[PDB]
Amino acid sequence: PEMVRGQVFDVGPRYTNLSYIGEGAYGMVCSAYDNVNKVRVAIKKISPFEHQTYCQRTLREIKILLRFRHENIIGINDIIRAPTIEQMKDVYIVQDLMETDLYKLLKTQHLSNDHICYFLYQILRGLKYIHSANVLHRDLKPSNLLLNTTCDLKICDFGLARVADPDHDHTGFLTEYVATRWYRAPEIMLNSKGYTKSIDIWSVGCILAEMLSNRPIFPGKHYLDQLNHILGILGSPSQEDLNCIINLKARNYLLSLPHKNKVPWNRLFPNADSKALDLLDKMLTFNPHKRIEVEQALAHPYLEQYYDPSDEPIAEAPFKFDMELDDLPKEKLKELIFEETARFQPG
Numbered sequence: 001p002e003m004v005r006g007q008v009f010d011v012g013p014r015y016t017n018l019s020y021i022g023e024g025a026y027g028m029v030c031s032a033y034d035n036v037n038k039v040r041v042a043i044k045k046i047s048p049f050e051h052q053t054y055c056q057r058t059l060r061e062i063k064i065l066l067r068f069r070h071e072n073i074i075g076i077n078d079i080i081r082a083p084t085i086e087q088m089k090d091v092y093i094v095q096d097l098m099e100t101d102l103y104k105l106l107k108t109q110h111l112s113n114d115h116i117c118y119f120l121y122q123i124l125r126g127l128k129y130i131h132s133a134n135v136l137h138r139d140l141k142p143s144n145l146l147l148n149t150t151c152d153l154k155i156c157d158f159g160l161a162r163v164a165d166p167d168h169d170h171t172g173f174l175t176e177y178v179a180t181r182w183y184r185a186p187e188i189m190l191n192s193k194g195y196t197k198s199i200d201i202w203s204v205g206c207i208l209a210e211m212l213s214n215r216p217i218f219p220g221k222h223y224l225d226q227l228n229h230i231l232g233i234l235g236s237p238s239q240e241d242l243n244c245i246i247n248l249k250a251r252n253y254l255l256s257l258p259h260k261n262k263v264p265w266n267r268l269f270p271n272a273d274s275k276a277l278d279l280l281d282k283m284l285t286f287n288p289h290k291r292i293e294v295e296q297a298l299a300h301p302y303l304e305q306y307y308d309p310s311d312e313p314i315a316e317a318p319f320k321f322d323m324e325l326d327d328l329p330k331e332k333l334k335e336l337i338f339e340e341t342a343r344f345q346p347g
């Protein structure tokens, strides 16, 4: 078997000429020449079978990405594993090789308004399809947006994704949460489990702001500091928006804070297109009920050059498996991963 950087990367014989790319969320990623469709591909090594959390996440991503078919959503081309459960230690996921991701691009490259507009359109186009399947991505951020050499964009990493559940969204104040801090909607820290579509719109809003300046808009250093950043720009919530927070701990915390003024978008972003800032304002609305939805965001004047609802497909069916893998142990999960990957085995 092939070795990379003191690591078994056991993908051959179909996949050869391995080049290390980097480390992703939970393991080694290489490029490799695919001897069947004669292209280089991306391959990530997943070794999840020891920890139940890794298993739940691996299974979610596999079930979701195999069901989804969309130009702005990374596919799975191939899955490599051992022929038996007993021999299966790692899973290799084979995906289109992309030039970069938005996180690497923002650290090195100024974006023209035209590039911002096209990136934003494709994020929303992919997101319309995800949300139409009753799925929440829940971890949208620049490193989960892949780009090829012609700036086509694909959403990746559905490991934290869930079926939408708006009726069970309420929780207490300062409830712990898994998804990436800087892209977390203010309601997460106040009264939300992140079980509604509005959670993803907030993250897209943060990504749009970060494309305008190359810097995260709300770079919190800890759980409650995240809220400090958001309120520093949005200013104090209105009485009406507070009245929607019924939980007393969350309400009273907000009431305890000194009054803060809204920082106008055009001061924060002096070079930005005014229509881009109108859409940003609507995505970064404090109150999740008043926050723009994906389809409304697509219809916004900023995106008029691209908007074409007949060419913005939705999913054939909602995603069935509600998230109910939560109670399943590592061993049933290994079995389910084995089953879900069976189609990529010779015959």
Ligand SMILES: *CCC(=O)Nc1ccccc1Nc1nc(Nc2cncc(OC)c2)ncc1C(F)(F)F
Pocket (backbone or CB within 6 Å): 021, 022, 023, 024, 025, 029, 042, 043, 044, 074, 095, 096, 097, 098, 099, 100, 101, 104, 143, 144, 146, 155, 156, 157
């Ligand atoms: C979906 C998130 C992810 O897999 N990101 C990531 C992170 C680090 C290394 C590799 C990947 N995946 C990935 N990368 C490329 N292409 C690429 C090439 N040169 C640099 C980078 O920096 C991240 C990425 N293509 C495809 C993938 C894929 F996700 F499909 F496996």
